[PDB]
């Protein structure tokens, strides 16, 4: 499924992500936007086997097993594919362990380059939250 700006905002909140590790909800909506485009199915291969899956584009060399990325430790202990379903529990759930290992949302190339230090609040303006 491909989420609505507003809509995904809400969803992620229901699920504990607002100020999770002190990261505003906007950080999260902005990140997923430029990262996956509100599309939970999206997938992406980088050059080293590794692939990126779902709304928050979590990698497979560390977070989820996908059966074809050898370097794999399955820290999220979920099969990559689970991350693509129209239900972001797994992702959000897994996303929480990436945000807390140590590099905040810096672990996400995108938020950093295009979200980090912009007024992320405008992402959730107009939202009934």
- Looking at the chain, the number of H-run helices and the number of E-run strands are 4, 3
48 assigned ligand-binding residue = no
Four-point Cα dihedral 54, 102, 25, 43, nearest 10:
-10
48, 52, 87, 119: the catalytic one is 52
Q: Which domain holds residue 79?
A: 1-129
Q: For residue 109, give the CATH number of its domain.
A: 1.10.530.10
Strand bridging mode 43-45 / 58-59: unpaired
Chain centroid to CA 97: how far? 11
End-to-end CA distance of the chain: 21
Give me the half-sphere count of Cα atoms (radius 13 Å) on the Cβ side of residue 127: 19
Q: How many distinct structural domains can be found in the chain?
A: 1
35, 48, 87, 119: the catalytic one is 35
- Indicate if 119 belongs to the active site: no
Resolution at which this structure was determined, Å:
2.0
DSSP state, residue 2? B
Q: Which of 82, 84, 60 is nearest to 2 (CA)?
A: 84
- Indicate if 52 belongs to the active site: yes
**24 Cβ partners below 8 Å, 6+ apart?**
18, 120, 121
């Amino acid at each position: 499924k491909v989420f609505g700006r507003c809509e995904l905002a809400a969803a992620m909140k229901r699920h504990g992500l607002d100020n999770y590790r002190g990261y505003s909800l906007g950080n999260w909506v902005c990140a997923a936007k430029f990262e996956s485009n509100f599309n939970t199915q999206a997938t992406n291969r980088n050059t080293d086997g590794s692939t990126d899956y779902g709304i928050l584009q979590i990698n497979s060399r560390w977070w989820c097993n996908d059966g074809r990325t050898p370097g794999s430790r399955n820290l999220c202990n979920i099969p990559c594919s689970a991350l693509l379903s129209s239900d972001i529990t797994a992702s959000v759930n897994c996303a929480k362990k990436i945000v807390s290992d140590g590099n905040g949302m810096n672990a996400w190339v995108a938020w950093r380059n295009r979200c980090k230090g912009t007024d992320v609040q405008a992402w959730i303006r107009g939202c009934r939250l």
